[PDB]
From a paper:
To understand what structural adaptations enable XopD cross-reactivity, we determined the crystal structures of covalent XopD∼Ub (2.9 Å) and XopD∼tSUMO (2.1 Å) complexes. The XopD∼Ub structure contained four copies in the asymmetric unit, all of which were similar (0.62 Å root-mean-square deviation [RMSD] over XopD and Ub; Figure S3D). To our surprise, the VR-1 responsible for much of the observed XopD protease activity was not a β-hairpin as had been observed in eukaryotic Ubl proteases, but, instead, was extended and devoid of secondary structure. In the Ub-bound structure, XopD VR-1 threads underneath the Ub Ile44 hydrophobic patch, with residues Pro322 and Val325 making contacts to Ub Ile44 and His68, and also coordinates Ub Arg72 with Asp327 (foreground). Additionally, Met374 of VR-2 contacts the Leu8 loop of Ub (background). Incorporation of either I44A or R72A mutations into Ub suicide probes resulted in a dramatic loss in reactivity to XopD. When mapped to the XopD∼Ub crystal structure, the changes observed in the NMR titration experiment nicely agree with contacts made between XopD VR-1 and the Ub Ile44 patch.
CE clan proteases, specific hydrolases for ubiquitin-like modifications (SUMO and NEDD8) in eukaryotes, reportedly serve as bacterial effector proteins with deSUMOylase, deubiquitinase, or, even, acetyltransferase activities. Here, we characterize bacterial CE protease activities, revealing K63-linkage-specific deubiquitinases in human pathogens, such as Salmonella, Escherichia, and Shigella, as well as ubiquitin/ubiquitin-like cross-reactive enzymes in Chlamydia, Rickettsia, and Xanthomonas. Five crystal structures, including ubiquitin/ubiquitin-like complexes, explain substrate specificities and redefine relationships across the CE clan.
Residue numbers in the entry:
A (entry chain A): 311 to 515
B (entry chain B): 1 to 75
Write the structure that this text describes.
Amino acid sequence: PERIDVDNLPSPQDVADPELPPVRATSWLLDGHLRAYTDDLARRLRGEPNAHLLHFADSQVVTMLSSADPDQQARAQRLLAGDDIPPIVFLPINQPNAHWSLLVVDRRNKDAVAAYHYDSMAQKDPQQRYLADMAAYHLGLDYQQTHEMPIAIQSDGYSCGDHVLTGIEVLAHRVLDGTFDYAGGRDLTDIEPDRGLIRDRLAQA
Amino acid sequence: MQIFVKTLTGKTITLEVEPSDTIENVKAKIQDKEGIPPDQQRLIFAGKQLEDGRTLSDYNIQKESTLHLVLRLRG
């Protein structure tokens, strides 16, 4: 006996991590940090016009798209590419224990889907675009059509996560203003990430 | 007794553990088999995260149980 409660368990990626280390001035960002930031952002945009078009994807779900288990990758596609899923999706792309980069997919036009990849590294790694291609491939897109877009070049070896979070926040406010669609609307050449503001968001959330 | 550990990329890791084994000890076995340091491993069972200082028996984990291994991704 000694019955164990299994009534309505969360999926593994939604289980909390109470031992999640705090972020500092020079540490690399973790996936738990990225999600805490986007969970708070989605809350700050709630009720604003056009906020219903955005969806910030969990990085763990981005990796499940390439899972060898077919049930897992099907769950990821239901979470990222369904009829009730917002058409503008932000996918964090992780090179394990190395780098972070951003991939955006816009599905407003179902007969022509646009994809944008942002990589803040000075000399780009072919392996990073490869992982962005796998994500688009598993989302039913042609990876050859993904655009390699401009973003501010990191001047340290730890703020690639900051560039990802800042680009997500900056672009989201452009969807709210309607400037996302102007010429150069998806250009992030002039962003300036702020470690202190990011730490502030995580504290007061 | 043999337990199973499933990652989110579709890999199952099998282990030969004892009920008296600690959570930290199980993680070292996973390090031995896959090279992942224990500072990155998050073991999950019945939708709950396991504390390093408890035992497999404390969580009523029986033979052939399935655990989830979620990683702390960094960059």
